[PDB]
């Protein structure tokens, strides 16, 4: 009750310093105003072509302008999943004591925890009509995705759903930060050497999580057990994602993690 107190703070700053897009900024672009040049709406194949085209900035002379689209969208998300994975790695090594764990172990904690964490925050930028893409610049409509030729139309629908209820809980960045730290720091990951320091460590996060959640949303007494359940709805959402995504490694196999993720991958960080 001293160092375990500034522990919650230190984890909120880690978040308010490693995530380019949080819920407040995110909530103002969506519901917002004070800017009359809102996100660019991607509501169909034509607009999705402009979007994805300028995005890879090697596609207004080259040729990537009309292949099945269902598989074009499966590209941006990657030119958006290196950014995403690194901020969660910095934010994590900014988590008190996390930098301790033997590196080899720090890879294990972020490897199985990465996806749960993403979808958790992914909820900050979503709303019942569509999510925000590209740092708040564009806004892809929910409908447009569930219309793509199967089995695509069912990749983003499970997440949107989970997020509509998760956003009902009404957390904020101070909450989300702890929540997200607690999913990284979970000692039930396969191959952990010091499978005990991670728990000791984790007890703090979840302990502050409970206390912060009592004096932050004092009227959802069962909000904490609620969130302990979500930490579960998410380990199983990723699980199903992993599946649905593999009808795309075997079948589609044109745009995979070919050894082309490297042209920017090395000399960059």
């Amino acid at each position: 009750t001293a160092d375990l107190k500034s522990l919650a703070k230190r984890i909120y700053e880690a978040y308010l310093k490693n995530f380019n897009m949080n819920k407040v900024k995110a909530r103002v672009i969506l519901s917002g105003k004070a800017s009359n040049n809102p996100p660019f709406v991607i509501h169909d194949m034509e607009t999705l072509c402009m979007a994805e085209k300028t995005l890879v900035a090697k596609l207004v002379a080259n040729g990537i302008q009309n292949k099945e689209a269902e598989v074009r969208i499966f590209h941006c998300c990657q030119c958006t999943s290196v950014e995403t994975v690194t901020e969660l790695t910095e934010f994590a090594k900014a988590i008190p004591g996390f930098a301790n764990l033997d590196l080899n172990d720090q890879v294990t904690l972020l490897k199985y925890g990465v996806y749960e964490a993403i979808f958790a925050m992914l909820s900050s930028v979503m709303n019942k009509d569509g999510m925000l893409v590209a740092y708040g610049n564009g806004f892809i409509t929910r409908e447009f995705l569930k219309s793509l030729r199967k089995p695509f139309c069912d990749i983003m629908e499970p997440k949107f759903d989970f997020a509509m209820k998760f956003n009902a809980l009404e957390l904020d960045d101070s909450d989300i930060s702890l929540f997200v730290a607690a999913i990284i720091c979970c000692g039930d990951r396969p191959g952990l050497l010091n499978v005990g320091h991670i728990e000791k460590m984790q007890e703090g996060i979840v302990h502050v999580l409970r206390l912060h959640l009592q004096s932050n949303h004092p009227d959802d007494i069962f909000l904490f057990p609620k969130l302990l359940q979500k930490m579960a709805d998410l380990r199983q959402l990723v699980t199903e994602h992993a599946q649905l995504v593999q009808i795309i490694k075997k079948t589609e196999s044109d745009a995979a993690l070919h050894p082309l993720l490297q042209e920017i991958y090395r000399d960059m960080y």
């Binding site: 910095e90 490897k111 990465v114 993720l261």
Partner: peptide
Amino acid sequence: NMGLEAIIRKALMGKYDQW
């Protein structure tokens, strides 16, 4: 998940900055 520790192990070493 799956193994992308590639990208994650490189963001592990290559920064500098801290309050």
